[PDB]
């Protein structure tokens, strides 16, 4: 179990750690979070009490170093930092654990939600999508744009997600125009799986990262990517049996963890009514379909 301590909490903010959150008052005694499970990526995120504009957050992994949060009053946000000094670190964290100034990452033991949402997500790939290499952790917020969006403006603050475009040359083999556009198997399996992602786990990982950035930060370009990558599999007649099974589990938990009052903006009607009821794989997503009908039949 590891710890993300805080130098202080100068402004009133709601802090999130993975799917958990808690309100901190202006200048409340508060030196961070403890008991964070090792072996998963995490994200710790922020929504100021004054300006609900700009949710922002840091993806990180406790194995890749010691990371703490001091507020920056010039830039006006909680920043993630990384010390070297192991010994200064262990002993200062120990001080706060002693005065009990940290909240406990509150994991119920029966619960595998986080594992399920982040099964295939690895910090190595996150850092390729969010380019900023002097830091072991990755900053994301509400308004960052994707590589594909800037095609249609600041590249440093982009999310360099894999570009998917159904009406593109990459996706459509000359001479198979109609075949490749109504059965994307070629695009999924050869171009993307064999070509760009190499295996389904890097694919699924980008999928899972996109959705999490949509949900936590309401990043619109992320929700587009999540939806595109779902659509490409469901519109593929030929998908390995194991991908179809894993995808059903994956989506199931993403739909499970979505806030019920957020479904109007983060869920795309066309994509889901197609994946669930028209696409090749309309029969292959039993758990995902079952929960979407019991929880969001309005959309359908």
């Amino acid at each position: 179990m590891n710890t993300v301590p805080f130098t202080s909490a100068p402004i009133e903010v709601t802090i999130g750690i993975d799917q958990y959150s808690f309100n901190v008052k202006e200048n409340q005694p508060f030196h961070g979070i403890k008991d964070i499970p090792i072996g998963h990526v995490h994200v710790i995120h922020f929504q100021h009490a004054d300006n609900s504009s700009m949710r922002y957050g840091y993806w990180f992994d406790c194995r890749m170093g010691n990371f703490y949060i001091q507020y920056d009053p010039k830039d006006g946000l909680y920043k993630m930092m990384e010390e070297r000094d192991g010994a200064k670190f262990e002993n200062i964290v120990h001080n706060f654990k002693e005065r009990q100034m940290m909240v406990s990452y509150p994991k119920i033991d029966e619960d595998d939600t986080w594992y399920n949402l982040t099964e295939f997500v690895q910090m190595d790939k996150i850092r390729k999508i969010v380019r900023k290499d002097e830091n072991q952790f990755s900053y994301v917020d509400s308004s960052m744009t994707t590589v594909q969006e800037n095609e249609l403006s600041d590249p440093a603050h982009s999310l360099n997600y894999t570009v998917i475009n159904f009406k593109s040359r990459e996706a459509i083999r000359p001479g198979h125009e109609m075949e490749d556009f109504l059965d994307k198997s070629y695009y999924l399996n050869t171009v993307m799986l064999q070509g760009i992602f190499k295996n389904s786990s890097n694919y699924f990982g980008e999928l899972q990262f996109a959705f999490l950035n949509a949900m936590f930060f309401g990043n619109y370009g992320s929700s587009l990517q999540w939806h595109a990558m779902i659509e490409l599999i469901c519109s593929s007649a030929t998908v390995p049996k194991h991908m179809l099974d894993k995808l059903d589990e994956i989506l199931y938990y993403q739909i499970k963890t979505l806030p019920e009052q957020y479904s109007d903006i983060l869920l795309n009607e066309r994509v889901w009514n197609i994946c669930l009821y028209s696409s090749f794989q309309k029969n292959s997503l039993h758990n995902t379909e079952k929960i979407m009908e019991n929880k969001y039949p309005e959309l359908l």
């Binding site: 009406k167 459509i172 125009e177 109609m178």
Partner: protein, 237 residues
């Protein structure tokens, strides 16, 4: 964007453009089988690709043979239309390729866009107008060449005959549409009008009779009357 009454005069500027109509590409005759079931038998179709400014018609003949052994023919007809339109463009010299292509049925947007991925500077557009190009097969010479063809075949026409010698594009297009609209609403009568007077003839290299200008006004009037009526006959007013 979409094409409608408001941006109506763009068709006649100097940017090359083509209308594509696909109604008559997949044509069937629904019959009864010996067992008392129903089957379709296909007959020849055409893609009606037309330059509304010059009146050049690229009449691509779709021969029944193209459907042999295929499923979901109504759906394939749209992709086959897109494939033939894209090859026509490829065959044209660059200075002749259209900058725009207007499909008369919105179902053709995606098939063409995909077949035209190599032509990003050509804009594919739909339209809000209810144009009557379906009636193109009521033009005898056009029906004739289609039904007689024995293999795939492109056949070039000018749908305006010689009109442009005396009238503007704008006006030529309004006569074409007024003629097709009448042929669509009541073919028999429309044709009776065009060929009542045996003294007016159809030159062998034309599609429509050789009317003088005065005759064309008389003829145009009579077509408008027909179109109004069949709207009464149909709606009781």
């Amino acid at each position: 964007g979409a094409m409608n009454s408001s941006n109506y005069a763009e068709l006649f500027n100097n940017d090359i453009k083509l209308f594509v109509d696909d109604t008559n590409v997949y044509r069937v005759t629904v019959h009864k089988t010996f067992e008392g079931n129903v089957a379709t038998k296909a007959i020849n179709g055409c893609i009606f690709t037309l330059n509304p400014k010059t009146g050049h018609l690229f009449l691509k003949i779709i021969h029944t043979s193209v459907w042999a052994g295929q499923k979901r023919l109504s759906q394939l007809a749209k992709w086959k239309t897109a494939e033939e339109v894209s090859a026509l463009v490829r065959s044209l010299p660059k200075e002749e390729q259209p900058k725009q292509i207007i499909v008369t049925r919105k179902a053709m947007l995606d098939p063409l866009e995909v077949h035209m991925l190599d032509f990003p500077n050509i804009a594919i557009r739909p339209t809000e107008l209810r144009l009557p190009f379906s009636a193109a097969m009521s033009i005898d010479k056009l029906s004739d060449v289609v039904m007689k063809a024995t293999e795939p075949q492109m056949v070039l026409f000018n749908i305006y005959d010689d009109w442009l010698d005396r009238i503007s594009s704008y006006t030529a297009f309004s006569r074409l549409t007024l003629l097709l609209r009448a042929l669509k609403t009541n073919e028999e009568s429309a044709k009776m009008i065009l060929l009542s007077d045996p003294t007016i003839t159809i030159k062998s290299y034309h599609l429509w009779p050789s009317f003088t200008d005065e005759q064309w006004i008389t003829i145009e009037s009579q077509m408008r009357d027909l179109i109004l009526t069949e709207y009464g006959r149909k709606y009781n007013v």
